[PDB]
Design a protein around this ligand. Structure first.
Ligand code: NA
Length: 160
């Protein structure tokens, strides 16, 4: 119930893997450091809402915070992946266990959070990549794993 869930060497070395469902991303148009924590949390909650209302079968299924949240990218939304969380990156690998959906360098991650009780299986993180710029990426996790994922993302960030 307290503290990191995995040995530090594991997170620093190969990373920790999870099976989750990538749910797409939502462009983020302000630096997270310019916003208060409560606002950061609202942005992630709303990004989760945006993707869940579009992607069929999403467990969590005018808009607020349109100054901060922009367009959705649904190209890879709904796809099962292996997420590998390490000190180098968040690595997102497709169901063939070959194709890389995304590899978000850890140094590019500027916020991570869960949802609320209605979206408790979701993880949101704000990253940069050359495709999506600053965007909020959404993962739908199996029961139990969302908090593990969020904790381990922090562990990786800190150990980097
Ligand atoms: Na390493």
């Amino acid at each position: 119930s307290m503290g990191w869930l995995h040995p530090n060497d594991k997170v620093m070395g190969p990373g920790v893997s999870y099976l989750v469902r990538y749910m797409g991303c939502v462009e983020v148009l302000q630096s997270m450091r310019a916003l208060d924590f409560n606002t950061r949390t609202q942005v992630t909650r709303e990004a989760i809402s945006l993707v869940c209302e579009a992607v069929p079968g999403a467990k969590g299924a005018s808009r607020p915070l349109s100054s901060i949240l922009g367009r959705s990218n649904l190209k890879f939304a709904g796809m099962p992946i292996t997420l590998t969380v390490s000190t180098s990156s968040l690595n997102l690998m497709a169901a063939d266990c070959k194709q890389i959906i995304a590899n978000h360098h850890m140094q590019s991650i500027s916020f991570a959070s869960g949802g609320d009780p209605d979206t408790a299986e979701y993880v949101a993180y704000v990253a940069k990549d050359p495709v999506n710029q600053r965007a909020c990426h959404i993962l739908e996790c199996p029961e139990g794993l969302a908090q593990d994922v969020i904790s381990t993302i922090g562990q990786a960030f800190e150990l980097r």
